[PDB]
From a paper:
Albicin is a potent inhibitor of the alternative pathway of complement from the saliva of the malaria transmitting mosquito, Anopheles albimanus. Here we describe the cryo-EM structure of albicin bound to C3bBb, the alternative C3 convertase, a proteolytic complex that is responsible for cleavage of C3 and amplification of the complement response. Albicin is shown to induce dimerization of C3bBb, in a manner similar to the bacterial inhibitor SCIN, to form an inactive complex unable to bind the substrate C3.
In the reconstruction of 3D class 3, density covering two molecules of FBb was observed after refinement applying C1 symmetry, allowing the structure to be further refined with C2 symmetry enforced. The von Willebrand factor A (vWA) domain of FBb shares an extensive binding interface with albicin and its secondary structural elements are well defined along with the side chains of bulky and buried amino acids. Density for the SP domain is much weaker, making it difficult to visualize side chain and main chain details. The C-terminal end of the C345C domain of the C3b α-chain, which normally interacts with a magnesium ion at the vWA MIDAS, is also disordered making it difficult to verify that the MIDAS contains bound magnesium and if the C3b α-chain is associated with the metal. The albicin portion of the FBb binding interface is made up of the C-terminal end of α3, loop α3-α4 and loop α1-α2. In the region where albicin interacts with FBb, Asp 19, at the apex of the α1-α2 loop, forms potential electrostatic interactions with Gln 411 and Lys 429 in the vWA domain of FBb. When the two complexes are compared, albicin is found to extend further along the surface of the MG6 domain of C3b than does SCIN, thereby causing FBb to tilt away from the C3b surface relative to the SCIN structure.
Author numbering:
A (entry chain A): 1 to 641
B (entry chain B): 776 to 967
C (entry chain D): 1 to 116
D (entry chain G): 322 to 535
The structure:
């Protein structure tokens, strides 16, 4: 009997367009099907619309798009997990699979013009309302402002209808207010448990007149180095001029949450030409702490608290840099991107995330496997270095350790890491694999891609398979489905792919086929892969000055500035003096933060592959149910371990 | 203000999505200006010095700057209605200077001070009028007027509760000063 | 030169503005005229040979029309302030935009008097 | 001088496209689209006339990747390329036809070899991956136990080595170190050998053309 397969996202979202790809294998003729959704438990009949018929001309393919209504029954309970039932009626065959339903229904981004506000001054913040697809949406937003001790002071109830997703709001701080770290928190009406927040502080400040940046030569301190830590002070006026003053430097060890100061490291270096340097002899660092041991200092950190004073004795600026690590190794190895399951007798990919000790990705550092060290590669601009190891067709797990092989360094300084990968497990030990080898480079929208489908099966069953089914995730929901044909005998099939601007920032690709094997038992083999895309705006907004002459405009003199953006869009602007950024540069907003939030809000957390087909689909964030009885695992936790 | 401005742009496209522009820098710099550096808040009837900086970023030309402090009835400086406080300073090129003044605040609220500079042998002037906040002497202190538990069934009987809050004497409060009073209400969550 | 600057200062010290109008408005208007119709014009005029002759008829015309445009700005600030309350700083700041725009366009048009 | 008068705002060249394809494996097309004067065009969507779903955009070097699914037949294979840039009519788009010949083995034993390479603006230092796609029946598959690949820069043997391959694998991957001595191009040449037919020695070879940033 032909098998009917329904693929839906593993987590559903209220008030959103969620697709449900309907596919049938070996179907004969037109097979109409109506999809219905029922609450669990009970039967509340939330939605049973969007029925679709199937056609053999379109390879029995079809996707239904709808939106789960938001009712008080879902909002009645907010502290426990809730589920719904999706049921499909493939003619005379019935299939139904339960699925978890979350309460997230969009994102909130809070932009404040400044980051520090004096008492008695106004506050201007904008609330951005976007959905799971990062589009303007009309909802209801609650806004609250909380003082540092945790007491709401002002609450509102706005609506994003007719505002095109931008809600400008203002608030007036009383002239007599307890200073500290104020907080602004907002949440959607449907999901009061989901709280978004920003942080702005109230201070008794006056704007400075210059910026001080302390940049050590290397973002670390080698423990065995004899010269010691070197830090360079670069004091520059805000309006692009150099400083002639004097500076004070003090070095302290930051272990845990307790800061230990070094009285003997204080120096008075005269900054000249907007530059200066100061040394820290290793003897001072060793003797400052009680224990003269060396290895105990590993894991701690240093911080520089530089104070700069002009020769005129007018203004003082305190600039602090903290978090410089004390690590015996100038490099770090991470395996957050490498798949945890390989395929026996099949090429295996090893994405190594080589990064600087502070956390920033490294660049152009060689890496190599310990065994058969002839394999070498260099990290790209993103801090990821490709690797390739040939895997023997043995069911025994394989252990891989990688070690950087940069020259001019000893064997002790190179960072090491060890990883254990489990072999892919089939059904009935039929030795049926699928692998998907794909380019993983600094991909950009528009540039093409070449997915390499690599089937591996015995010649007795190489003719039953006649196609492939592949899906593309993006931001938690599907983006595109399709069938890639494969005539018998063609071992390798290439699938051209169009990476548009909608694939930002990381699309997860899955692929699977099906046939009858063993002694008449239906089975499925699947695969998944993780691909990165350049993090940039879906559109293109650029701000540039129209006036190309009359350098350094006089105050009070006009200029014209162009806004190059996509047509029909709404642009919000804000001009901020750089003094406040000198005195506070945290809790801002940028494209990187937005993409980090979107990536964090994903549904799967295993970069490709898995223990088995059910594991692969569960990790990829999809549930797969068949008419025959084949099914994936069960997901009942919002946050993966 | 003589400084550099940062412009941050955010779009909202109905079809594309949301974008955040890279910061844009414009540097508003003049060849001659004044940067009045002030403490954020001073105390009434207590002398505090102030510093005016006369920058000069021209070429090797020399400037014979004349700076004066116009009289303000809300401050006690050397400037009066009739007399004037004038200085004739010289700024070497690509250098700076600092002219100190003594100012004694008189009335609370929000007062302003300003200086004006005129260049000799040329014709260019720049005056800066900033406002420094004046606060009468004192500190912050917060005594609790009263704390009580609302329970009409347990307190007051008859399912009702009448609570009397005596106003704080505040005999040490500074005259002519505002005083807020935040009222907080919090229920008692009982469950299980 | 120097005599030309003295003549320009003599012309710009004949501008008569009402004291009865609001102090902040008066300061804003004076600052606008000083930074958009005095500083560039004084910079242009200062770089002339002493023998060069300077016209004054259309400079007096400049003064007459700057009187009338400041009068129109005060009109927009006083009662034609529909968006906010009359004599409020909000619509003063709102009208400062087109006031300064008109002034700079005026200067760009009048840059042809300075040489006959 | 030299501004042309051409009814088609684009040109298509097949100088970099291989003239022989292995049946039953992806035959790669190096479409070389250039401006009418001669400069390499950038960011124009090229496509195959059949199955228009396949398309790609040119890189900064004026070459666009392509991929077709060749059928396992010995008949000649014909490809025509027609750009499908929008806001232009059907006559402005440039067209070009090309007829490719199938690889011919010895003894008609279908002992093929394919060697697919990443094709982009390569730089010295950056690693590269080559895929060795063997094609033989499992009866004689176990005999091959290695590969031999040669590198040629400026017409000399730059590096010769042997890539091992354990039996049972349908493909292997050979990491490559592109130093500064590989400029500006090189040609991998991979071959193996085994006894074939009924006692006749057989050799099957392959080659690929790779560009490096100048
Ligand atoms: C999933 O649903 C979308 C809904 O639009 C389908 O998108 C349409 O695809 C057809 C051909 O594939 C186009 O002619 C239409 O223009 C598309 N619609 C829009 C609005 O652009 C999509 O095809 C569906 N997925 C599959 C695999 O069929
Ligand atoms: C009074 O204010 C202080 C901050 O100065 C803060 O601890 C709290 O609001 C009050 N103190 C106490 C002990 O409640
Ligand atoms: C010869 O081949 C070997 C193979 O490893 C290679 O290392 C060497 O550079 C080549 N040239 C010479 C002269 O050996």
């Amino acid at each position: 009997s032909p098998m009917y397969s329904i693929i839906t996202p593993n987590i559903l979202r209220l008030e959103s367009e969620e697709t449900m790809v309907l596919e049938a294998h070996d179907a004969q003729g037109d097979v109409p099907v109506t999809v219905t959704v029922h609450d669990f438990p009970g039967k509340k009949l939330v939605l049973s619309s969007e029925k679709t018929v199937l056609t053999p001309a379109t390879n029995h393919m079809g996707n239904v798009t709808f939106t789960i209504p938001a009712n008080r029954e879902f909002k009645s309970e907010k502290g426990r997990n809730k589920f719904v039932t999706v049921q499909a009626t493939f003619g005379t065959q019935v299939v139904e699979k339960v699925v978890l339903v979350s309460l997230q229904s969009g994102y909130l981004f809070i932009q404040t013009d400044k980051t520090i506000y004096t008492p008695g001054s106004t506050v201007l913040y904008r609330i951005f309302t976007v959905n799971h697809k990062l589009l303007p949406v009309g909802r209801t937003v609650m806004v609250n402002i909380e003082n540092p001790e945790g007491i709401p002071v002002k609450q509102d109830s706005l609506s994003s209808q007719n505002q095109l997703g931008v809600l400008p709001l203002s608030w007036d701080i009383p002239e007599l207010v307890n200073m500290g770290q104020w907080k602004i928190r907002a949440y959607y009406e449907n999901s009061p448990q989901q709280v978004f927040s920003t942080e702005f502080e109230v201070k008794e400040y006056v704007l400075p007149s210059f910026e001080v940046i302390v940049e050590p030569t290397e973002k670390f301190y080698y423990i065995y180095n004899e010269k010691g830590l070197e830090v360079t002070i670069t004091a520059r006026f805000l309006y692009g001029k150099k400083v002639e003053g004097t500076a004070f430097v003090i070095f302290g060890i930051q272990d845990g949450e307790q800061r230990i100061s070094l009285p003997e490291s204080l120096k008075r270096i005269p900054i000249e030409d907007g530059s200066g340097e100061v040394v820290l002899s290793r003897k001072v660092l060793l003797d400052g702490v009680q224990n003269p041991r060396a290895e105990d200092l590993v894991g701690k950190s240093l911080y520089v608290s530089a104070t700069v004073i002009l020769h005129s004795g007018s203004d003082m600026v305190q600039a602090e840099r903290s978090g410089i690590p004390i690590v015996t190794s100038p490099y770090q190895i991470h395996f957050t991107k490498t798949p945890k399951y390989f395929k026996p007798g099949m090429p295996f990919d090893l994405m190594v995330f080589v990064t600087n000790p502070d956390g920033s990705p490294a660049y152009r550092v060689p890496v190599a496997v310990q065994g058969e060290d002839t394999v070498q590669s260099l990290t790209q601009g993103d801090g990821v270095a490709k690797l390739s190891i040939n895997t023997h067709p043995s069911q025994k797990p394989l252990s891989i350790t990688v070690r950087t092989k940069k020259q001019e360094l000893s064997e002790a300084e190179q960072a090491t890491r060890t990883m254990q990968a489990l072999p892919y497990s089939t059904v009935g030990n039929s030795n049926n694999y699928l692998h998907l080898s794909v380019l993983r480079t600094e991909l950009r929208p528009g540039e093409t891609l070449n997915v390499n489908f690599l089937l591996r099966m015995d010649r007795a069953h190489e003719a039953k398979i006649r196609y492939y089914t592949y899906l593309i995730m993006n931001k938690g929901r599907l983006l595109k489905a399709g069938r890639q044909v494969r005539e018998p005998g063609q071992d390798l099939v290439v699938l051209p792919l169009s990476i548009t601007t909608d694939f930002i920032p990381s699309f997860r690709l899955v692929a699977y086929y099906t046939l009858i094997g063993a002694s008449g038992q239906r089975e499925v083999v699947a695969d998944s892969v993780w691909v990165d895309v350049k993090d940039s705006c879906v559109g293109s907004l650029v701000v540039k000055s129209g006036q190309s002459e009359d350098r350094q405009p006089v105050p009070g003199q006009q200029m014209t500035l162009k806004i190059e953006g996509d047509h029909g869009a709404r642009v919000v602007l804000v001009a901020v003096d750089k003094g406040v950024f000198v005195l506070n540069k945290k809790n801002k907003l940028t494209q990187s933060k937005i993409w980090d939030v979107v990536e964090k809000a994903d549904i799967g957390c295993t970069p490709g592959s898995g223990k088995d087909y059910a594991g692969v689909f569960s990790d990829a964030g999809l549930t797969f149910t068949s008419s025959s009885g084949q099914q994936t695992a069960q997901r009942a936790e919002l946050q993966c371990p | 203000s003589i400084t550099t401005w940062e412009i941050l742009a955010v779009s909202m496209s109905d079809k594309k999505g949301i974008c955040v522009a890279d910061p844009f820098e414009v540097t508003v710099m003049q060849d001659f200006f004044i940067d009045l550096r002030l403490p954020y808040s001073v105390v009434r009837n207590e002398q505090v010095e102030i510093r005016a900086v006369l920058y000069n970023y021209r070429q090797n030309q020399e400037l014979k700057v004349r700076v004066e402090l116009l009289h303000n009835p809300a401050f006690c400086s050397l400037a009066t209605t009739k007399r004037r406080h004038q200085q004739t300073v010289t700024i070497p090129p690509k250098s700076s200077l600092s002219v100190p003044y003594v100012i004694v605040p008189l009335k609370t609220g929000l007062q302003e001070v300003e200086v004006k500079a005129a260049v000799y042998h040329h014709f260019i002037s720049d005056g800066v009028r900033k406002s420094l906040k004046v606060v009468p002497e004192g500190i912050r202190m917060n005594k609790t007027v009263a704390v009580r538990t609302l329970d009409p069934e347990r307190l007051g009987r008859e399912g009702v509760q009448k609570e009397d809050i005596p106003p704080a004497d505040l005999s040490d409060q500074v005259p002519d000063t505002e005083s807020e009073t935040r009222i907080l209400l919090q229920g008692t969550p009982v469950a299980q | 030169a120097n005599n030309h600057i003295r003549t320009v200062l003599k012309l710009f010290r004949t501008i008569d503005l009402d004291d009865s109008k609001k102090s902040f408005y008066l300061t804003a208007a004076k600052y606008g005229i000083q930074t958009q119709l005095r500083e560039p014009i004084i910079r242009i005029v200062g770089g002339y040979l002493p023998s060069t002759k300077l016209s004054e008829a259309c400079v007096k015309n400049m003064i007459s029309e700057v009187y009338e445009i400041e009068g129109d700005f005060y009109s927009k600030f006083s009662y034609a302030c529909e968006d906010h309350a009359p004599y409020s700083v909000e619509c003063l700041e709102d009208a400062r935009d087109d006031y300064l725009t008109q002034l700079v366009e005026l200067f760009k048009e009048t840059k042809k008097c300075l040489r006959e």
